Design a protein around this ligand. Structure first.
Ligand code: ZN
Lengths: 248, 149, 99, 714, 174, 56, 271
């Protein structure tokens, strides 16, 4: 097949976006069984496929979010007797995003992967603004390290799966059903399955290694055959299934 | 992208209806038509280029990129987006192409012609790596599939 | 293959030979078909180059008309007298004693 | 109503071709070499010095190359024809002699005639028999009037030196690594200094890389070592843009943490890091003075010039973060061509230098001590070395310029005499560097910068598709310039020396830079008036017509180019909605009063480099002219080359069909020359009764192809 | 609304110690710290425009008629000859020119500035303004070892002078 | 935001001021004492509208 | 559009030509000047003119960390030795600046003073940038380090040491400082106001624009490679420069076979 193939254009699954590699390079990667791979697509099924707003809500629950985006304003603060970092939260935006967050959730995120800071260093004034206090560096660096901290915390994750990049709601139109379904990229299946709302027992990953790591090798054996047949036909070459079953 | 999808959409419609407004006027006993009906040689989409209109010459599935600063050639204004300035060729092979159209069309020809050798570069080593791991399996008289051991 | 220039060349060459003139075929120019077509009818040939033809095996006329004309053909260096080759049991390499 | 067309434009093409054009690249380059370059290269090594005995020296004063002749067994000579050399396996060459002076205890010994070696001669160059002859007296030499020339004869086998393609030098470029991290690099090539330099941003702070250092080194430490001691200067030389400085800011914390703040502290800090075979101060300083960013000039220890050079390059990196896009690797404006002259000159340099030094070896071994009386150099002034080196390089086809450190191969090919076309199409060929060493895969395709300079439809079948290519039918390749006057015009027109400025100035959006061949000149306002002044003076003809000027408003810099090796092409000038040329001019040219050169000085046509081609607008046919036009296309079919010019009606066929014919014209059996019966070649194919085509192109009349036809009409 | 979003920060942050008029708290107003621009160097608050040469002269002549120092850039050569020196290759220059009145300067309708130079006219253009400071000085070297020095003032703006080659080659085209 | 010493031109650094906090030069005795309250403004970017409104 | 406004005259002064020098501080924004600062010593090396300054700075003031001043004062000089002490007092009461040469030729640059109705010009004998000296760290390091502690030919003509010896051969010439507030400044500033009438025809500036162009931008090549007898192809419409007429017609008539004379004088000129 690798010789007769045309490898035609316009493969976007009907959403004019999020194309993937096909043909010779894809097969060259399926068979190498590399435990790491690009384009780590994951599919998932909703609890109700017509609940559009709830679909968006679970999307928000699963998508990665950062302190530097949930806030429209951040500032370093210097006072003659104190120094501290300030953040102003985007309240109306959070309502609009339907994000299930609260100011203090940042505090819980704080003291994780941030080197000796304590929750008491954070002054949660209220729903609008929260702030954090520095500490004596005491070695290898000076107190004015504030600058490094001030530009670093905005990067910290506050809500969502760390390993996900983005998720897209796919819609269909056929007479059987005009409904929605959720498509996600990111190389960790176990996380997406472990949430409310998602019909986890139907979730499917394109990369072999993850499904093997989570569902066992007998599920890997089936994902190979699905994947090879999927790529062959989505080109349009006919290979008898018994010829691929042996390979798996 | 929204704009460009509309552009390629309209241009494709131009070719679809141009071929449509050609296939019905051809006589029976016309030769390209006969050889394309029975299917031995050619295709309808091919007759349309050879008579009616050659299409948008996409490079790797996109409109021809801008080579110079914000334009494909000097012969067109900077930041211009009109169809002719990004690959569309309005002539058929019967009226004959014009300098810019000829240059863009030969660019799309060379893109493919580079491929034929290259797409054999990986094929050979799948053909090798596979058979070198899998040529030993054979089917026994008890209907099982067994390796050498 | 879509070689239309080969369809045209065979026509312009015909009007050239019948009138005694060499026709230009430059790029983005050359002699136009809308114009050569009338030199044929001046000599009594069909204005699109296809002619009557009679079968030399049966003697009864063909059922279609046929496209006659003069085309430039150029012979190439790859001859078959130079390419045939067959071995029974000739010499062998010393290091690894196969042919 | 349309503009009245000047229908006779095509006459200009024979006028251009009867002086320039096909095969003339090779001939002109060799002609330039043997007549002005050999003299400079000898001048650069005019005197050798003794080991002892002051005022003992040996001096060259002038050098000659003569005309071709043959050895004979009685130390006697006769001139020879090209064909006697083809038939006798000899080597078509001419002796080299020098006017040497050498010491004798007596104050002088003059010489004028001394054989130092041999030089092969390119056919039809100014020192060969065939030049200037008439077709009726070609017959007496057994040579053919139509033969292209431009190739050599060595050991009896005709050989060609293919046109090579190089990447441009001394020119900064920023790029994204495989890991995504940005970087920048230049090759600071003087006559020998091919050494590279590089910088990295690997972690969020900028650093340099070199073979000379054992680790990597950040920007600010070198800025301190360079003589910029204070911190206030840096924000000047980088700019006052808040996000730019914000990005730069962290790139100095790791520096100011280290308590190194004055130049010598830095020097002794980096001095310990050198790859050697307190002294570290001077050892570091010479390194920073002579071996890093060498192409940028400085007077003694006035480091300011290269300080700003680092500043500008770093600024580009910063703005690379805002937008990742860069200039493509293969935009033809950034690629240079090497002909026979540059290749051969680089070889003769090393060979002559090594001759002189080896002569010194034997001299030093005897002269002071080995006799009671002075030695004579004529006892050792030997002359087979130059001959051996030259002939072996041309015949074998691979050179080792071990001073330059390059060991390329595939520089020569035997001239294919399959037909008439194969010879010509061979003469205009170009090879390339990649040679399937890396998976670039991009450069095989065609880029729009190739318009008109290179043939679109000529590229070999098979694996080398897109690597080899062929020159178009009207294109000139420019020679190098002596750089004298052009600096003066900028100095007067409004440039302000950067040496006098602080650094804030390059920040304002109302100022532009100006470079010349990748070298910095000053700072300018109203770039437009510079361009208008330049073209207005170049049209009237003070400056050389091949000098080019161009602008890049995103970078707010203006580029001046005068280096040699970049292609150029003529266009008609247009102004105020009408072409400059007129039908009356064109009639005069037909009558023979005015020739091409007149058109050049009357400001009716001009050369446009591809790099300058970017800024103007060109109309194809005159009826498409509008307000914005700036030139016009002389004859559009010159987009096509020499083998693509046999195809009639190529603009009707599907292009893959025209590429395949471009490689079967080079194989059709036909005729080879008028002397075809007298040559004894290893293999030669002829047709018995050849006929000329009935439908014929116009390029098929410029190359006189229907005098040597290769087909039949069926 | 600004203050409405600001109230929570107002409730905690609004302290300051700027009333401490004593050593380890005070700042003298002349010893400000420095930011990268002269215009931006107004950091301790108690709470660029465009111009054309003709306008600058107009202000210095009418709106406030006062003398001021300038600095100009001269072209490489003047349209005379090296006085009694006859060029070797020395260009006619101002360096050795005679004292006193030497010429005039004129500006046109529509604001073109030009410099009357004998038979010919030369164009003048403004250079680049800067934030930093420049001054003019001189030295009274009366003795072989010692002397006295004087400073005359600060230069404000600088100019370039350049002949228009278009109006120069037009006398008779090459 | 970077700040330079008027005394020596080098960037100023904050230190543990004795009564009120302090910018100080790393080398020269020039110093600066914090009197006023001061902040710098970041204004980060927010999420786009397409998929924030799409699907409600 | 005519030169209708602001027709100001121009004047030149040579009285201060050898005295004018231009000093600037890139580190000092224009919004303040050094008028209040006493410069305690000034110096020049006239040969290869280069300048050094020395000036005072206040110490009692709150923006002075007197503790830091004392601590570093004990270090930049010998703590209690003061062999080459730069500050007899234990505090940094003074600073020094260095200078850097800006160009090798100041001739094309002149100072200009504007006055209502008159402009006065004078060349500049030199332009130097100014640098704040950071050398005190260097001598602190030197103090700490010292506390812790015929002939063959050469090819070293380009040596740093050689040019530093040439530089060291000139001893430093000292000057007495006087600020801009001194009446000395105006007393000498008047010298630039050169005497003369409002306007007189200049002895120079006589050359014509065509003449001015030719010697402004002279031919780079002073002798032509080939003769105008046409040993190689040569211009035809641009009449041969010096060729005798009898040979000019010969050149013209080798091109065209037959020709009625009536069109010739267009080529050889009506004269
Ligand atoms: Zn400081």
């Amino acid at each position: 097949p690798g010789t007769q193939m045309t490898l035609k254009t316009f493969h976007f699954a009907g959403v004019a976006s999020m194309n993937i590699t096909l043909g010779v390079p894809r097969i060259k990667e399926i068979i190498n069984a590399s435990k790491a791979i690009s384009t780590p697509i994951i599919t998932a099924q909703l609890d109700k496929d017509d609940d559009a707003d709830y679909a968006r809500l679970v999307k928000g629950r699963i998508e990665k979010t950062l302190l530097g985006e949930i806030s429209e304003y951040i500032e370093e603060v210097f006072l003659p007797d104190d120094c501290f970092i300030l953040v102003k939260l985007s309240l109306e935006r959070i309502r609009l995003l339907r994000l299930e967050v609260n100011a203090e959730t940042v505090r819980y995120s704080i003291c994780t992967s941030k080197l000796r800071v304590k929750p008491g260093d954070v002054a949660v004034h209220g729903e609008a603004v929260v702030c954090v206090t520095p500490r004596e560096n005491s070695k290898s660096s000076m107190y004015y390290v504030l600058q490094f901290l001030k530009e670093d915390l905005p990067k910290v994750v506050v809500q969502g799966i760390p390993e996900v990049s983005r998720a897209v709601i796919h819609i269909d139109e056929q007479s059987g059903k005009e409904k929605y379904k959720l498509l996600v990229e990111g190389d960790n299946l176990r996380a997406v399955m472990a949430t409310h709302g998602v019909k986890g027992t139907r979730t499917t990953s394109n990369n072999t290694y993850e499904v093997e790591k989570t569902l066992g090798i007998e599920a890997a054996r089936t994902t190979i055959i699905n994947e090879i047949q999927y790529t062959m036909v989505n080109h349009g070459m006919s290979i008898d299934r018994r010829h691929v079953m042996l390979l798996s | 992208e929204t704009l460009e999808a509309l552009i390629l959409k309209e241009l494709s419609v131009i070719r679809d209806h141009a071929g449509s407004a050609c296939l019905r006027e051809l006589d029976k006993s016309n030769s390209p038509l006969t050889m394309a009906l029975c299917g031995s040689k050619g295709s309808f989409i091919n007759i349309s280029q050879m008579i009616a209109c050659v299409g948008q010459q996409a490079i790797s599935g996109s409109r021809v990129p801008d080579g110079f600063e914000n334009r494909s050639l000097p012969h067109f204004e900077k930041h211009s987006k009109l169809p002719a300035a990004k690959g569309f060729v309005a002539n058929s092979f019967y009226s004959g192409l014009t300098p810019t159209e000829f240059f863009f069309h030969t660019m799309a020809g060379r893109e493919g012609l580079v491929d034929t050798a290259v797409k054999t570069a990986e094929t050979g080593y799948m053909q090798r790596r596979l058979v070198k791991s899998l040529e030993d399996l054979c089917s026994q008289y008890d209907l099982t599939v067994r390796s050498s051991t | 293959r879509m070689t239309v220039g080969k369809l045209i060349e065979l026509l312009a060459g015909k009007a050239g030979v019948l009138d005694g003139r060499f026709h230009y075929g430059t790029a983005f120019g050359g002699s136009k078909v809308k114009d050569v077509c009338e030199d044929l009818v001046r000599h009594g040939y069909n204005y699109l180059g296809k002619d009557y033809v009679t079968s030399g095996i049966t003697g009864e006329p063909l059922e279609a008309y046929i496209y006659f004309g003069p085309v430039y053909y150029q012979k190439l260096k790859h001859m078959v007298l130079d390419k045939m080759h067959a071995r029974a049991r000739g010499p062998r390499a010393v290091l690894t004693r196969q042919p | 109503a349309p503009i009245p067309t000047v229908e006779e434009k095509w006459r200009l093409l024979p006028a251009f071709l009867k002086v320039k054009g096909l095969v003339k690249q090779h001939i002109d380059s060799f002609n330039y070499f043997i007549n002005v370059e050999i003299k400079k290269i000898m001048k650069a090594n005019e005197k050798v010095t003794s080991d002892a005995d002051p005022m003992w020296y040996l001096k060259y004063l002038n050098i000659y190359v003569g005309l071709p002749d043959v050895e004979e067994s009685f130390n006697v000579t006769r001139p020879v024809s090209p064909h006697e050399c083809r038939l006798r396996d000899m080597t078509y060459s001419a002796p080299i002699t020098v006017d040497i002076e050498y010491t004798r205890g007596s104050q002088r010994i003059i010489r004028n005639a001394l054989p130092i070696g041999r030089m092969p001669i390119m056919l039809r160059s100014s020192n060969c028999v065939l030049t200037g002859k008439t077709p009726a007296e070609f017959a007496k030499l057994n040579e053919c009037p139509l033969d292209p020339g431009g190739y050599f004869i060595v050991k009896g086998v005709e050989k060609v030196i293919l046109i090579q393609e190089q990447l441009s030098k001394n020119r900064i470029i920023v790029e994204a690594d495989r890991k995504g991290a940005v970087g920048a690099s230049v090759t600071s090539s003087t006559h020998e200094k091919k050494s590279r330099t590089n910088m990295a941003v690997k972690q969020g702070r900028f650093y340099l890389r070199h073979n000379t250092l054992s680790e990597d080194i950040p920007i600010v430490i070198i800025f301190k070592a360079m003589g910029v001691e204070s911190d206030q200067e840096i924000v000047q030389m980088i700019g006052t843009e808040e996000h730019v400085m914000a990005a730069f800011g962290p790139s100095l914390e790791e520096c100011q943490k280290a308590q190194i703040f004055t130049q010598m502290q830095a020097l002794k800090y980096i001095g310990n890091k050198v790859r050697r075979q307190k002294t570290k101060i001077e050892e570091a300083r010479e390194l920073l003075a002579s071996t890093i960013l060498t192409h940028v000039p400085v007077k003694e220890f006035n480091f300011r010039a290269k300080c700003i050079y680092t500043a500008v390059m770093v600024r580009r990196v910063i703005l690379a973060q805002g937008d990742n896009k860069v200039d493509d690797r293969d935009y033809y404006g950034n690629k240079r061509l090497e002909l026979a002259g540059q290749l051969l000159s680089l070889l003769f340099e090393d060979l002559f230098k090594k001759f002189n030094s080896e002569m010194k070896k034997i001299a030093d071994q005897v002269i002071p001590k080995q006799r009671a009386a002075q030695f004579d150099v004529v006892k050792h002034m030997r002359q087979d070395q130059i001959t051996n080196g030259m002939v072996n390089a041309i015949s074998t086809g691979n050179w080792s310029l071990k001073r330059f450190k390059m060991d390329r191969q595939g520089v020569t090919q035997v001239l294919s005499r399959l037909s008439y076309i194969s010879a010509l199409g061979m003469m205009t060929r170009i090879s390339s560097q990649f040679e399937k060493t890396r998976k670039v895969s991009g450069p095989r395709s065609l880029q729009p910068s190739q318009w008109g300079m290179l043939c679109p439809s000529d590229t070999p079948e098979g694996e080398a598709c897109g690597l080899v290519k062929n020159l178009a039918l009207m294109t000139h390749i420019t020679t190098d310039m002596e750089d004298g006057p052009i600096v003066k015009l900028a100095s007067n027109l409004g440039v302000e020396d950067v040496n006098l400025l602080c650094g804030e100035e390059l920040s304002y959006p109302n100022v532009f830079l100006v470079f010349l061949n990748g070298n910095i000149l000053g700072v300018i306002r109203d770039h437009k008036k510079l361009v208008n002044t330049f073209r207005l003076m170049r049209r009237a003809g003070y400056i050389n017509e091949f000098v080019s000027i161009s602008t890049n408003l995103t970078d707010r810099c203006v580029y001046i180019s005068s280096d040699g090796g970049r292609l150029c092409r003529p266009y008609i000038i247009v102004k105020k909605q009408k072409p400059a040329v007129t039908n009356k001019h064109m009639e005069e040219l037909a009558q023979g009063y005015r020739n091409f050169e007149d058109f050049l000085h009357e400001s009716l046509v001009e050369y446009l480099d591809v790099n300058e081609e970017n800024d103007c607008n060109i109309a194809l046919y005159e009826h498409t002219i509008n307000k914005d036009t700036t030139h016009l296309e002389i004859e559009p079919f010159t987009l096509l080359g020499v083998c693509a010019g046999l195809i009639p009606y190529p603009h009707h066929n599907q292009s893959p069909r025209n590429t395949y014919q471009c490689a079967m014209g080079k194989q059709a059996m036909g005729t080879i020359g008028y002397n075809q019966r007298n040559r004894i070649d290893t293999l030669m194919y002829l047709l018995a009764y050849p006929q000329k085509p009935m439908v014929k192109t116009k390029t098929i009349e410029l190359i006189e192809f229907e005098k040597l036809p290769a087909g039949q009409n069926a | 609304q600004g203050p409405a979003e600001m109230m929570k920060k107002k409730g905690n942050w609004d302290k300051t110690v700027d009333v401490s008029d004593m050593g380890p708290s005070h700042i003298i107003n002349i010893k400000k710290e420095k930011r990268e621009t002269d215009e931006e160097t107004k950091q301790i608050l108690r709470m660029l425009p465009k111009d054309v040469s003709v306008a600058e002269l107009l202000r210095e002549l009418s709106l406030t008629k006062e003398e001021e120092l300038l600095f100009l850039q001269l072209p490489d050569t003047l349209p005379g000859q090296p006085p009694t020196q006859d060029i070797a290759e020395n260009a006619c220059t101002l360096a050795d020119l005679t004292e006193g009145q030497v010429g005039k300067l004129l500006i046109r309708k529509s604001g073109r500035v030009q410099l009357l130079l004998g038979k010919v006219t030369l164009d003048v253009t403004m250079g680049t303004a800067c934030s930093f400071l420049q001054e003019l000085v001189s030295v009274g070297l009366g003795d072989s070892r010692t002397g006295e020095m004087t400073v005359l003032g600060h230069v404000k703006h600088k100019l370039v002078c350049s002949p228009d080659f278009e109006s120069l080659l037009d006398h008779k085209h090459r | 935001m970077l700040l330079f010493c008027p005394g020596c031109g080098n960037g100023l650094i904050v230190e543990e001021g004795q009564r009120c906090h302090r910018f100080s030069c790393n080398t020269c005795p020039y110093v600066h004492n914090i009197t006023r309250k001061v902040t710098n403004r970041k204004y980060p970017k927010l999420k786009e509208v397409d998929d924030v409104l799409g699907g409600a | 559009d005519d030169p209708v406004v602001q027709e100001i005259d121009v004047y030149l002064a040579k009285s201060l030509a050898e005295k004018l020098y231009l000093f600037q501080y890139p580190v000092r924004p224009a919004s303040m000047t050094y008028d209040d600062i006493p410069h305690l010593s000034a110096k020049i090396k006239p040969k290869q003119q280069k300048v050094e300054l020395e000036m005072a700075i206040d110490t009692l003031n709150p923006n002075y960390c007197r503790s830091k001043g004392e601590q570093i004062a004990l270090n930049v000089d010998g703590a209690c030795a003061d062999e080459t002490s730069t500050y007899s007092s234990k505090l940094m009461d003074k600073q020094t600046f260095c200078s850097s040469q800006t160009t090798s030729n100041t001739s094309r640059y002149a100072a200009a003073l504007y006055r209502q109705g008159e402009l006065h010009l004078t060349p500049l004998h030199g332009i130097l940038q100014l640098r704040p000296s950071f050398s005190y760290l260097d001598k602190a390091d030197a103090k700490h380090r010292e506390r812790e502690a015929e002939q063959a030919r050469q090819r070293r003509v380009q040596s740093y040491e050689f040019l530093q010896k040439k530089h060291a051969e000139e001893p430093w010439v000292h000057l007495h400082y006087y600020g801009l507030r001194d009446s000395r400044s105006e007393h000498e500033r008047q010298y630039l106001l050169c005497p003369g009438s409002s306007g007189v025809e200049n002895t120079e500036l006589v050359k014509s624009p065509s003449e001015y162009l030719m010697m402004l931008m002279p031919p780079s090549q002073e002798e032509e490679k080939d003769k105008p007898v046409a040993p190689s192809n040569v211009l035809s419409m641009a009449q041969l420069r010096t060729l005798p007429l009898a040979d000019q017609i010969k050149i013209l008539m080798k091109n065209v076979k037959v020709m009625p004379f009536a069109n010739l004088m267009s080529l050889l000129g009506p004269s």
